[model samples]
Target: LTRTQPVELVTMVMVTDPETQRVLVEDKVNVPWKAGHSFPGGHVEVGEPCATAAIREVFEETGLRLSGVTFCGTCEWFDDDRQHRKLGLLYRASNFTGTLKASAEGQLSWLPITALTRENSAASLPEFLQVFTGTASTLVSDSWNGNLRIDEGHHHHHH
Candidate 1:
């Protein structure tokens, strides 16, 4: 069989609580993957920087203003169920401010960053989510290695 896949540039942001080391996640619903917790993300609009989309999507879903947003990496994955090719720019940020609430998407909750995966499995993320984690794992799954540090610069756009 032959196919041409629909492509999208998406952004995913993981917000970490500094004091308690918990992470903000959404209990996704009414979408693919049967409703599990996932990082805040969505398609990057035309001519929008991936970093800006990261913050925009996060705020739209979480109502929180995030600071120090930066690119961690990008992962290319194909979804059969949705039949789309996705190129996701993964992002990391330390803190956010504003009241949080549940959106049409899902209910929001804070989970211990370490509580995410156990027994060598991803409870809340995709099974092979390690690919998307990139260097951001230091800010997410690695248990408060230090502070949420990122480059003051932006990602170099590719042609």
Candidate 2:
């Protein structure tokens, strides 16, 4: 199928210290949809590498420079009204070094990964965490005129 349409690229990163089982969390404010705790990430600038965007976002929001970034998976959706595809690149980082600080994006904190839950996180967070944890590789969150539906599955492609 050939078509011309806009694609909005977004990024989300789960920066963790595997040894301590702690992950970065942002107490989001003034963000789209519900505002609550979630990972730090943002939009990809023009011509910027998607992975690079994830790293930048994490630093901007949490003041931590992430290293050893890994592309874990993706969470994507289509906006029927806008006729555009919103693709969110998901990444995980286990090595980072910097003084932690909060930004206008939100208050930053590090919490145990197991401490995250629907009650403590943003509306879309828990689902995205699945991809971050490698429980799944792709999360399809299609929004049609504001009705959100999520479908979860795995990708078997290794080549």
Candidate 3:
């Protein structure tokens, strides 16, 4: 059996427009991997709340101060070739206060919620599009990458 790396927490934020129904997504410009398409996210700092990390990442990448931020879900992915695992906390923010500016990390755009799964959008997002349509709950937990085991459960424990 291969020894897997310890799980690390990553936080992701999804910003949406109530009127236009568009979701804010980012394209990583200079990153070594996933350079063109990825949600705004990053590693969670030690002892930091997942929601706080999500909001911080958004602000750092988009210059948007997010409000109404809610805990949406969690996901796990394992890279078979790299032999590592990533655990992600997903969040949604319907309210925000700031101006849209070019992110140092990449280009940012507001995409229609319905159009998110289209070819024009990021390739990494189709897997979770259903959640935005209310077809699924706000919370999710799963194992991705190479591990076959997936554990889906509610995250209600207070930190």
**Candidate whose TM-score is highest:** 2
Local distance difference test, each candidate: 0.62, 0.76, 0.65
The runs of at least 3 residues in candidate 1 whose Cα sits more than 4 Å from the true structure, single-residue gaps closed, are 1-7, 28-33, 78-85, 102-106, 118-159
* TM-score of every candidate relative to the true structure: 0.63, 0.80, 0.69
Clashes per candidate (backbone, < 3 Å): 0, 0, 4
Worst 10 residues of 3 by lDDT: 141-150
Candidate whose lDDT is highest? 2
What does candidate 1's lDDT look like per residue over 97-132, in tens digits?
Answer: 876854543477777756665342224254224434
lDDT of 2: 0.76
Using alpha carbons, what is the TM-score of model 3? 0.69
Tens digits of per-residue lDDT for model 2 on 1-159? 296568889998988876677887876566556767878789999989999898898887777888758998877776655467888889998888886773443377778878888787876677788888887787675572232234544433573
Instruction: Give residue 123's lDDT in candidate 3 (0 to 100).
Output: 41
